Amino acid sequence: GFTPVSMRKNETVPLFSWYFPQGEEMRQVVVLQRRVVDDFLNSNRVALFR
Amino acid sequence: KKPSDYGCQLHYKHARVVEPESTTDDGMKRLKDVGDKGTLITAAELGLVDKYRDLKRAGQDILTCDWPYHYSSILYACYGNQYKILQMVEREFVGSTQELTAMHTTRCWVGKNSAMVAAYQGHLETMLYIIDLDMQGKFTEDLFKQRDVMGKNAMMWAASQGHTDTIEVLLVRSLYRLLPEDCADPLVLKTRWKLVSLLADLASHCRDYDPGCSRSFFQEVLASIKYDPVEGARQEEAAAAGGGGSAREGAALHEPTWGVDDGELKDVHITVRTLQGVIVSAYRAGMNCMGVIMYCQSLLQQARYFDDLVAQLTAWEVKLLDTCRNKQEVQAILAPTEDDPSEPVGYALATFDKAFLSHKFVQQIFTEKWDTMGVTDYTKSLFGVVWGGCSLVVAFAAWATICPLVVVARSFLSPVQDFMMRGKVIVDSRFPWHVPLYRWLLTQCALITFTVLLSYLVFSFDPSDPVPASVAPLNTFLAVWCAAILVDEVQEYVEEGRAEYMSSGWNVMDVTMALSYILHYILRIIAVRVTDNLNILLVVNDLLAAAALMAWFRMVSVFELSSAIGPLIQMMKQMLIKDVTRFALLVLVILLGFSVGMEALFQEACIERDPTTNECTKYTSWFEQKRVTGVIFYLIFAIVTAILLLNLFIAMLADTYTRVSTQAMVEFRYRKAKLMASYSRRDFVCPPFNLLHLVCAAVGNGLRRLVWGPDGFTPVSMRKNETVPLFSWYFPQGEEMRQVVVLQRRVVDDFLNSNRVALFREKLNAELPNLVHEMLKQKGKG
Amino acid sequence: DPSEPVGYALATFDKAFLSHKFVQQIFTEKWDTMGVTDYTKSLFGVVWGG
Numbered sequence A: 001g002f003t004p005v006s007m008r009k010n011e012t013v014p015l016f017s018w019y020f021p022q023g024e025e026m027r028q029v030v031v032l033q034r035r036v037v038d039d040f041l042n043s044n045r046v047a048l049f050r
Numbered sequence B: 001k002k003p004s005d006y007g008c009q010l011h012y013k014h015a016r017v018v019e020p021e022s023t024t025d026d027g028m029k030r031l032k033d034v035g036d037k038g039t040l041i042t043a044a045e046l047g048l049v050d051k052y053r054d055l056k057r058a059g060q061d062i063l064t065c066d067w068p069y070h071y072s073s074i075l076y077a078c079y080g081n082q083y084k085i086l087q088m089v090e091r092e093f094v095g096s097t098q099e100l101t102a103m104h105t106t107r108c109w110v111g112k113n114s115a116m117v118a119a120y121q122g123h124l125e126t127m128l129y130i131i132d133l134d135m136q137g138k139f140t141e142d143l144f145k146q147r148d149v150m151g152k153n154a155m156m157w158a159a160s161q162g163h164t165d166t167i168e169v170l171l172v173r174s175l176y177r178l179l180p181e182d183c184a185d186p187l188v189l190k191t192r193w194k195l196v197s198l199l200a201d202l203a204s205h206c207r208d209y210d211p212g213c214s215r216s217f218f219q220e221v222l223a224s225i226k227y228d229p230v231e232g233a234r235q236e237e238a239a240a241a242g243g244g245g246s247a248r249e250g251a252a253l254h255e256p257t258w259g260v261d262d263g264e265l266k267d268v269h270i271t272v273r274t275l276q277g278v279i280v281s282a283y284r285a286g287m288n289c290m291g292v293i294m295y296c297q298s299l300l301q302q303a304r305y306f307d308d309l310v311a312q313l314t315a316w317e318v319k320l321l322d323t324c325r326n327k328q329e330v331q332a333i334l335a336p337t338e339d340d341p342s343e344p345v346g347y348a349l350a351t352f353d354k355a356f357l358s359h360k361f362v363q364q365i366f367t368e369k370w371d372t373m374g375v376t377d378y379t380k381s382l383f384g385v386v387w388g389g390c391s392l393v394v395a396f397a398a399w400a401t402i403c404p405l406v407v408v409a410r411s412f413l414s415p416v417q418d419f420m421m422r423g424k425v426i427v428d429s430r431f432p433w434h435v436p437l438y439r440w441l442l443t444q445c446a447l448i449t450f451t452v453l454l455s456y457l458v459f460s461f462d463p464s465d466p467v468p469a470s471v472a473p474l475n476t477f478l479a480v481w482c483a484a485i486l487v488d489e490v491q492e493y494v495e496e497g498r499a500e501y502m503s504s505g506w507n508v509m510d511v512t513m514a515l516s517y518i519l520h521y522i523l524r525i526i527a528v529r530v531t532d533n534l535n536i537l538l539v540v541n542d543l544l545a546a547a548a549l550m551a552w553f554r555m556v557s558v559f560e561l562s563s564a565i566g567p568l569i570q571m572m573k574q575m576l577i578k579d580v581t582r583f584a585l586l587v588l589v590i591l592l593g594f595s596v597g598m599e600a601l602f603q604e605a606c607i608e609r610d611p612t613t614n615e616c617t618k619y620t621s622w623f624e625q626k627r628v629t630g631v632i633f634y635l636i637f638a639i640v641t642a643i644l645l646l647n648l649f650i651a652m653l654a655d656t657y658t659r660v661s662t663q664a665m666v667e668f669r670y671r672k673a674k675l676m677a678s679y680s681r682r683d684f685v686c687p688p689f690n691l692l693h694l695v696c697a698a699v700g701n702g703l704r705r706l707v708w709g710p711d712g713f714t715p716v717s718m719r720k721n722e723t724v725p726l727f728s729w730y731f732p733q734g735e736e737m738r739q740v741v742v743l744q745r746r747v748v749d750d751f752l753n754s755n756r757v758a759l760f761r762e763k764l765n766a767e768l769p770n771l772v773h774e775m776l777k778q779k780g781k782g
Numbered sequence C: 001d002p003s004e005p006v007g008y009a010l011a012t013f014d015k016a017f018l019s020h021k022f023v024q025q026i027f028t029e030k031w032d033t034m035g036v037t038d039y040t041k042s043l044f045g046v047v048w049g050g
């Protein structure tokens, strides 16, 4: 393995290091996402009421 | 059937391998890279609280450093936002808060400190920790005004790098330190509490380093303000119950918020209602209200991502200055009293304020003081241009025999210096040395004189003339002149500084035509009897050509005060600042690209040789279809270049159009305000005659100190008289001070009311169907 | 959910998303975490960076 791969623009890298978060960082993202999206979905539900 | 349509289009493409134990917190994502060598500089970068403690409790140091970059152990802790160990050290392993400072302000190799290395990376959870320590007063250093060795500071790093989440935090603590610490006022204590809870509810996810009891971040700071947020919630409901008992027509920060519905704390960002909770409250603490609006605008213009708030604070600065109705009220909101010695005029000059100095009431306080006789307005009549022009030629003849004598006499005669001090008053035409327009006219009449004598020198140059053509009387008088111009620029480089010096555009041309002719005067002498060659002779004729242009480009300076030619000096200056240095770097690429291609076409070849190198066919300058193939590339290269320059000339016609059309009187009137304020703080001397007293003041000041001693009113060699203020109405002393206070309360309490109404109207526009729905919801409940 | 939205936006050329303050901030802390792009606005930066 670990051959110098014959391509530029490497594929065996997610672009950022904060991608797929295994462990108890998944449980803290999923809480922190649901805080953000639930506070977004009821500022549309206010602005569609006006 | 197993993939969806969303799945083919949006999921992660490739197949990865799950790492066994890979964290994604800020430290400990970097264990494979930094290492785990156990050295307190790795234990802080990684965030190992236990290995920082045990390596210190038994061991090493606290402030060792790397070689190339001089980062401490502390400076890795906030490089990777490990506030857990910075808080460990501050709670234990430090005492004597001068040791807490010097551990944070240590330095780096570029010049960072602990709050600049946590600022050029967006590290909220740590930038909220150093900001926590200032409000508690742990630092005796104010570790946010320090500069690295690039000019930057804590907030110029987070603004250039673009960390908007941190710029908001660095700006709330700067809106907080404005409002005074110890003040008994139930409404500066509201807006100090509304801003520290803006930070405390913004960290609020920043547990301590241990169990503890949550400490959240700002417990010791919100508990030092003494504001009950529910008792003060009804101080305003009862004061704004019948029109206003805060004396500002309401409680002055109180509106509806009737209540909005959903159907079918949370103000975290800095709103406009946040910035007028500061301007109202800073005015109710004693401060200048124009000063806070200029100060809050200078904050948000180095924040760089706040352009809906700079547009509002520039609109309130011009709205305050139109509430002012006569000159008596304009100079009563701008005057520094004895209580708050804060001028907002001289601070608008120092930060290059266009929208303030262009205003019609601010152009009036300058021209009242700079003209005071009306002799500008004598050039709009039939019988005034004739008589006004005659007084120039007579007085400039009079400013040729008494000006070098009074310059010498003020050195050695004490009666004549007290005669030359009969100004600093209502100053009029009796003593024309002290009215600031006339000192501008003797500057320009000594400047048209310089380019006539210089252009007479290049015309009345006789070539068949011996070596006294070098040292002539006229050739060496112009060299003494340009000697004394260079000494006058070093005076106004040290006095008025560097940001002011390189903000005029004529101070460069005063040096460069003086430095060229004084180098022309030397190299002509050397090339006429020492070394007589045409290599350096053609440099001598090249400096005098360069020094004769910059004489005549300097003579468009008389038109700076004229309307209709004044804005052509400014739309030509701004064109050479903004536009030319980005279009000349592309014309240089296009023309060098076109020039190498023409050499590559018009390139000779050799077809005639049987043995070795008989002949070569000649091609022009730089059958057989042979001259046609190259000329169809000569036509493609010339067309696609000339179209490419014309595309770039439309880009310059349309950049200068947008500045001419919008902002031409603003640039013109800004320069008049910058020109009327230089000549206010200046004497009456000219470039040829300051050196005439810079030798006499080196003698005439000393002769009164060896035998007399404390003489007084000695001629200062420093220009820009710094004792006297800018205007004569600055500091009142008595009944003028009691009247100005009555006029500024009258003006700015009706500035601040008509912003409270005009903000609420935009709240009632966008939320109008919710007020009507609350009037019908009462049928629902009661 | 293995769905990345950053890689989909720069595949479909999404100029309103892809130039926000918060998206230009997550690219900058990988592209340039040191601020070398601002060693041009100073005399010390051009000499020592150059």
Ligand SMILES: CCCCCCCCCCCCCCCC(=O)OC[C@@H](COP(=O)(O)O[C@@H]1[C@H](O)[C@H](O)[C@@H](OP(=O)(O)O)[C@H](OP(=O)(O)O)[C@H]1O)OC(=O)CCCCCCCCCCCCCCC
Binding pocket: B352, B499, B501, B502, B503, B504, B505, B506, B508, B509, B541, B542, B543, B545, B546, B549, B550, B553, B556, B569, B572, B573, B576, B577
């Ligand atoms: C190739 C160049 C072509 C130029 C064409 C010149 C056409 C002349 C038209 C008539 C001239 C009238 C207008 C000139 C008035 C003038 O002030 O000159 C402009 C200045 C531009 O700089 P600035 O002073 O305004 O200095 C700025 C300014 O102070 C900003 O305000 C600052 O920003 P700030 O506001 O924040 O402080 C800038 O700092 P920053 O880096 O931050 O931007 C600072 O650099 O240009 C000139 O003086 C030169 C113009 C005439 C050239 C005369 C010298 C040429 C002599 C060579 C002859 C060749 C002979 C050799 C062979 C014999």
Ligand SMILES: CCCCCCCC(=O)OC[C@H](COP(=O)(O)O[C@@H]1[C@H](O)[C@H](O)[C@@H](OP(=O)(O)O)[C@H](OP(=O)(O)O)[C@H]1O)OC(=O)CCCCCCC
Binding pocket: B375, B376, B377, B379, B388, B389, B392, B441, B444, B445, B558, B559, B561, B562, B563
């Ligand atoms: C002979 C001059 C004697 C008096 C000196 C006068 C000193 C001086 O500043 O005039 C410059 C002169 C005339 O221009 P000038 O200054 O008078 O321009 C008017 C002047 O600015 C008024 O004050 C303006 O009204 P305001 O302020 O907005 O209310 C007016 O605008 P508007 O509202 O009317 O439309 C302007 O038109 O321009 C030259 O040709 C250069 C000769 C310089 C001479 C250099 C030495 C030879």
